[PDB]
Design an enzyme around this catalytic site. Structure first.
Site, PDB file in Angstrom:
ATOM      1  CG  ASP A  49      14.129  -7.105  -7.259  1.00 20.95           C
ATOM      2  OD1 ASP A  49      13.321  -6.146  -7.170  1.00 20.95           O
ATOM      3  OD2 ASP A  49      13.763  -8.291  -7.406  1.00 20.95           O
ATOM      4  CE  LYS A  88      11.597  -2.362  -4.857  1.00 25.95           C
ATOM      5  NZ  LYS A  88      12.440  -3.486  -5.363  1.00 25.95           N
ATOM      6  CG  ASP A  97      12.065  -5.478 -10.621  1.00 26.87           C
ATOM      7  OD1 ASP A  97      11.429  -5.098 -11.631  1.00 26.87           O
ATOM      8  OD2 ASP A  97      11.648  -6.381  -9.870  1.00 26.87           O
ATOM      9  CG  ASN A  98      10.044  -3.635  -8.173  1.00 26.02           C
ATOM     10  OD1 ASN A  98      10.803  -4.386  -7.564  1.00 26.02           O
ATOM     11  ND2 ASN A  98       8.931  -4.061  -8.750  1.00 26.02           N
ATOM     12  CD  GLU A 149      -3.421  -9.354 -13.688  1.00 29.36           C
ATOM     13  OE1 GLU A 149      -3.105  -9.093 -14.870  1.00 29.36           O
ATOM     14  OE2 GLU A 149      -4.506  -9.004 -13.172  1.00 29.36           O
TER      15      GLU A 149
END
Ligand SMILES: Nc1ncnc2c1ncn2[C@@H]1O[C@H](CSCC[C@H](N)C(=O)O)[C@@H](O)[C@H]1O
Ligand SMILES: [Ca+2]
Length: 213
Positions: A138, A141, A166-167, A196
């Site tokens: 995390d 990237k 993640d991501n 969100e």
């Protein structure tokens, strides 16, 4: 006075000391209702809970600690004698994360390693570390794929080691995905999570041509 300090101070005055669940709820409260911050958050946290519970790691490596939300999230589920190592290159974030762990009573389960993953990963074999049970990616990237390859090259992966990243959609890690999916060394599962809101640093570059060489 930084946002990260404001998060920590909120935790210290609203969460129950020594109570990791209470700390996560305080952070999630603060970051949904006062100031958004880059923690995984509760929705994704529940995916992480199930991965930890399904795969039963004794030794976890986290890449990217920030304020320690995800470190509290994973370490609160670990059995006695299990360890979490978390690499954080920003010394100020490492300091907040230590305070967060100390307040939650998890300092005995977690060890912060200050530095960049690409420098610290090849040093792990000198932390009484043979192989890792689970890695949570995390951090930056652009590092997912080289750190994964590095982890392999350093002999830190065992058959069955779990990588959780993640991501991988937003902002996205297509190179990493194509590598582990396309590789016969990795069995991959994808877990959707609705997001969100997220803000990331970006930039434009202006390059003025001065003529050829
Ligand atoms: N190469 C690297 N090594 C260690 N940390 C890195 C890194 N590149 C970026 N980071 C750190 O990675 C973090 C990403 S935010 C991490 C959030 C955390 N996993 C949570 O959900 O609570 C930042 O704190 C940044 O300082
Ligand atoms: Ca993230």
């Amino acid at each position: 006075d930084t946002k990260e300090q404001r998060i920590l101070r909120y935790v210290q005055q609203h969460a129950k000391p020594g109570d990791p669940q209470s700390v996560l709820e305080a952070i999630d409260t603060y970051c949904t209702q006062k100031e958004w911050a880059m923690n995984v958050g509760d929705a994704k946290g529940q995916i992480m809970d199930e991965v930890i519970q399904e795969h039963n790691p004794s030794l976890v490596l986290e890449l990217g600690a920030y304020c320690g939300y995800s470190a509290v999230r994973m370490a609160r589920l670990l059995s006695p004698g299990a360890r979490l190592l978390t690499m954080e290159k920003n010394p100020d974030y490492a300091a907040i994360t230590q305070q967060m762990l100390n307040f939650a009573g998890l300092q005995d389960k977690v060890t912060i390693l200050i530095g960049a993953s690409q420098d610290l990963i090849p040093q792990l074999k000198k932390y009484d570390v043979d192989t890792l049970d689970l890695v949570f990616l995390d951090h930056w990237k652009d590092r997912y794929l080289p750190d994964t390859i590095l982890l392999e090259e350093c002999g830190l992966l065992r058959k069955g080691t779990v990588l959780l990243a993640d991501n991988v959609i937003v902002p996205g890690t297509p190179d990493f995905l194509a590598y582990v999916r396309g590789s016969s060394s990795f069995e991959c599962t994808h877990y959707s999570s609705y997001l969100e809101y997220m803000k990331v640093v970006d930039g434009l570059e202006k390059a003025v041509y001065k003529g050829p060489s």
